[PDB]
Amino acid sequence: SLLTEVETYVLSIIPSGPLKAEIAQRLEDVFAGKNTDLEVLMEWLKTRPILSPLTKGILGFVFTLTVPSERGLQRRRFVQNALNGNGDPNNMDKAKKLYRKLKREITFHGAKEISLSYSAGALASCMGLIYNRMGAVTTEVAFGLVCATCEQIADSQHRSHRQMVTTTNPLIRHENRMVLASTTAKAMEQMAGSSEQAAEAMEVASQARQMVQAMRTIGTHPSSSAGLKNDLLENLQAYQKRMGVQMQRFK
Amino acid sequence: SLLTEVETYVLSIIPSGPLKAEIAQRLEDVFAGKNTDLEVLMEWLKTRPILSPLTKGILGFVFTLTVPSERGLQRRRFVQNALNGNGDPNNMDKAKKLYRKLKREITFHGAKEISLSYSAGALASCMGLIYNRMGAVTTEVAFGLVCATCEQIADSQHRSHRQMVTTTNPLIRHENRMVLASTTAKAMEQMAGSSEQAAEAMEVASQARQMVQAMRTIGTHPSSSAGLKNDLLENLQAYQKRMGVQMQRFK
Amino acid sequence: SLLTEVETYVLSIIPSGPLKAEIAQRLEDVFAGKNTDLEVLMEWLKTRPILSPLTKGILGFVFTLTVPSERGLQRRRFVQNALNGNGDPNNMDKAKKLYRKLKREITFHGAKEISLSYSAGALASCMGLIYNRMGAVTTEVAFGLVCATCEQIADSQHRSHRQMVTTTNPLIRHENRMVLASTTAKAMEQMAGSSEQAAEAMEVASQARQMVQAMRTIGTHPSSSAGLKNDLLENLQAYQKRMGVQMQRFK
Amino acid sequence: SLLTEVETYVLSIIPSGPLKAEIAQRLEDVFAGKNTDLEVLMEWLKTRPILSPLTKGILGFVFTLTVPSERGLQRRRFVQNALNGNGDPNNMDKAKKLYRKLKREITFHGAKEISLSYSAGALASCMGLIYNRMGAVTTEVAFGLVCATCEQIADSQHRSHRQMVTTTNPLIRHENRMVLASTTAKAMEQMAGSSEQAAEAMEVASQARQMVQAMRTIGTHPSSSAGLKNDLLENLQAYQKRMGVQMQRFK
Amino acid sequence: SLLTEVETYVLSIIPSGPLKAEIAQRLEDVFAGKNTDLEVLMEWLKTRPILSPLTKGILGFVFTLTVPSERGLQRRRFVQNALNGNGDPNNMDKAKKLYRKLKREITFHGAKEISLSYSAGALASCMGLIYNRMGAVTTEVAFGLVCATCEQIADSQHRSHRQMVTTTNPLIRHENRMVLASTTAKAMEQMAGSSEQAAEAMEVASQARQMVQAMRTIGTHPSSSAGLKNDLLENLQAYQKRMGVQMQRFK
């Protein structure tokens, strides 16, 4: 498919959080064709929290093609300013070399290959060029390009969140055990509320949010959070395993 | 048959999604002869999301012949501009060589053979020529041509989605496991709602949309989605197997 | 028909507004033959707002032929001055070449063809010549000429409102969202007042005129009008859809 | 359209306030053709509050063309003095270069293009020239010019209200929170009075005008207005959201 | 906006009290355009209580431009005498340097910038110069100047009410607790009288005006007013919180 190969190369560049859980409803209802509007979506996406201007741009290049109409309205400025890359003079023709190449392709992987064998930042300049003409580059090709633009990025993270240096301090490794549990427990309040019982594991999750409120409220020793996530899951490995979704995945 | 050999060569060029699930209702109700209009259909098809201008053209060449009347109205422009191919001077006569050949045939496969033994892009120029005269080429022949025009395309994809290069990153292979499940689970909410129970597998599918909302909401590790689609199907391999449609097909 | 092929080639040259909604009642009641007078109509048409002197002329050449009598009164001057084209010496005979050609035809499309294969401005000189003799050119032929004179114009706009350059500023794209809604909402006050309820959507439309009065009265940010028309229609997609006319056409 | 592309390029140069909410009723009833007079309108527009003499001039060049008659009365002086630009000798011919160019055009965007590729202040000199002859420049062309004259202005603001330097003082940032709320609350008294209840949110808005009267009456600390607009909207996000217009737009 | 950026730079220079609560109704009804007169307003503003002659002048320079007419009457003398600054010979040309600069600008922030990069008292001399000619300085520019003139002032206070030296005496810190409460309680009598109950918190506020009358009537010890404001608010944190405006803002 082609729409389950674009959300994948688009949702993998966004940080993890309720932003990515909302965007993935907009992208969903955009493809399906619900009653939606663009300038609503582009304003909601310009005010946003943490998001690279490049990443606010790609999602503007996406929602402008996918939407059920050819509005052709004022090409919004946060995108056109985002995809130039602060005007690098050394790729103005390189993008045009690519824009004139991609004008010839008709399939998806034909473009993603050509665009991968290319720089990691001049692709945006082509995307900011297609965001001004969009005349002979069909949308399948363009999705081949953003899937390359966003794969050069996703590899930038995979070479980063693997080259990390884990922490030695206990204070920080105490809070990480509290965050993960207080976070994981807030989800389980939601994953259960849409179920039939919603009364045995909504509580087992709430108290592990209270117990974490207490440690911060008491100044407890960092040797107390040890085994807090995995001890939460075990207590609702019965209710929220078959009367819920599943477990041994959140850890 | 002849109408179950035209939807096949027309629905195989369109990307996969709710577009193709809607088009295949328009093509259905067009052949059957329900109360339908053309300029409605041609406007709805001009505003559309991802679709090659060539592919917006073929479907205009189809719906103009299949519709229960000979309107002969203004030959809409997105088609006539789409099927010329940006005016290639090297096939103006080659199409006319074909247009004068196809004028002689009376059967379907007689045209699809002749049109296959020919270029992959000059066929459109003939189709844009039949879209201006349509005088001695019966509709059976024309359907022989679009079935060739769209088989040269469907082979272009089969030589593309087989020459692909699978991904190595886990972030991207984490999202693909979320998309496929969140997508597959949205269908099962629909394939069940038209059934008698609609209450055991509509939930088993909804929670696997919630559990996927949680991972994005938590930033879970990419080793958690492993076995999420096939683990969904197993939990409604009982309800949505005999009280539904069938399974072990979606994977 | 012949009168539904003259209002079409005459109402397509007039700008959009209450002028065109009034003219199309005069042209209607002229053909039907209601109790009407000419010099009333020609005075009302000389004082008018935005209208090309050429376009004030064609409508004088129309209403003078269509009216239920052969007055033959003083050929009013705003027309005769409008159709000469500021006295081009290079078409005085070309029009007379056409006036002597059109004297031979008896059908409509026979004239519209001959007059199309001709200049875009010497046609008026023929029309200003027929506006002085009108002796052997039957009215069917003359309507063949104005339908050509006004098709050379309507193509001038189609090559203009398609070659436009959309706006980038938000202030201007903020007001356009206010105009379209405040305009569209004034119509819906009228399209509902001639109905049975006239009380649920007359209000839903009035408040969206008040909310737009407020933004101008407050100096609101240009990211507030986003989704104002389409948000209006949705709120009276229930009342003014079946207890009214129809929708999803105004957008 | 052409009248929804003139109010947009005319209402975007006027400051925000009840002036712009009144002008946009005059421009509305002028196009529609209600019983209106010019010298009333030109006197009402000469006495006015804050408005650039240039901006008082453009609206005189507009209302003189749009009005349902060709009065041709004494060309009022606040316009003719406004559009010369204090007699710049370096554009007397440049305007005449433009006046002789625009005499040839028949469409709208043909003029707006030509007039954009030109100075930002010599356009007025052409407009003050058309305000003295108005002989071969049709009104469509002239509206193409004011839409350019007023786009050179609207870009002057967009390069100004974006280059602003936000305030650091709390006293000033205390009053801005009071103005916006006391202003926004006065509108909501009006947007509700034309509704059925007009009794739950007319009060919720009035008290937030009283609470702001109190701070000025008490000399309250600048850390009290923090969250006053958005706290107002929340209290009538129930009444004045569906029994009114809409919200989350005024902020 | 431009009128919600002038009341802010004008109401921030006036002391806090019923003066500022009245002025902010005059400025409001001036912009909106109610039936108002100038010489009424300028007399009411000349007799006034505490107000710097400079501050009585700026508000005369404001109300003279904002008012719906061009009276051009006798330039009232309390302004013209106020804005010269007791005739400083060392800025007669500096203002004229500014008056000739500001004659060139057309936008607001363009003037406020230029006028900020300038003295804190020669701005008035320019304002007293514009109060005599007002010929080529549009009102938008002038409002750019008073917004600078009054920002040099508002910073003078922010460098004053922050450099204060708090009091050590208890007698004075006893009365301040009585004033704030007796003042705050008089407002709450008003903020409640425009509500539905006006009977539970109008009394809770009146008695805290009586209890303060008693201390003055008894000569009570300064350790009795401690916790009088915050103890008042708590007793009508129920009535005058949802059946009123809001609280925890007055402290």
Residue numbers in the entry:
A (entry chain C), B (entry chain C), C (entry chain C), D (entry chain C), E (entry chain C): 2 to 252
From the paper:
The matrix protein M1 is one of the most abundant and most highly conserved proteins of IAV. It is a small, 252-amino–acid protein composed of an α-helical N-terminal domain (NTD) and a C-terminal domain (CTD). Ultrastructural analysis has revealed that the matrix shell within intact virions is formed by a single-helical layer of M1 that is closely associated with the viral membrane. Here, we show that recombinant, soluble full-length M1 from IAV can assemble into 2 different oligomeric forms.
Mutation of V97 to a lysine, predicted to disrupt hydrophobic interactions at either of the C2-symmetry and lateral interfaces observed by crystallography, led to the formation of single-layered oligomers. The M1-V97K oligomers are similar to the matrix layers observed in intact virions, which are also formed by a single-helical layer of M1. We observed relatively straight M1-V97K tubes in vitreous ice and determined a 3.4-Å cryo-EM map. The M1-V97K oligomer is a hollow tube assembled from approximately 21 asymmetric units per helical turn, with inner and outer diameters of 124 Å and 248 Å and a helical pitch of 42 Å. The structure of its NTD contains 9 α-helices (α1–α9) and is identical to the previously solved crystal structure. The CTD forms a helical bundle comprising 3 α-helices (α10–α12) that connect to the NTD within the same molecule via extended connecting loop 9 (CL9). Individual M1-V97K proteins are assembled with their NTDs skewed toward the outside and their CTDs toward the inside of the helical tube. Within each strand, M1 subunits interact via the stacked interface observed in the crystal structures of NTDM1. Interactions between the strands are formed between the CTDs of the lower strand and NTDs of the strand above: for example, between the CTD of N and the NTD of N + 23. At the interface of 3 adjacent subunits, all 5 histidine residues found in the M1 sequence form a cluster.
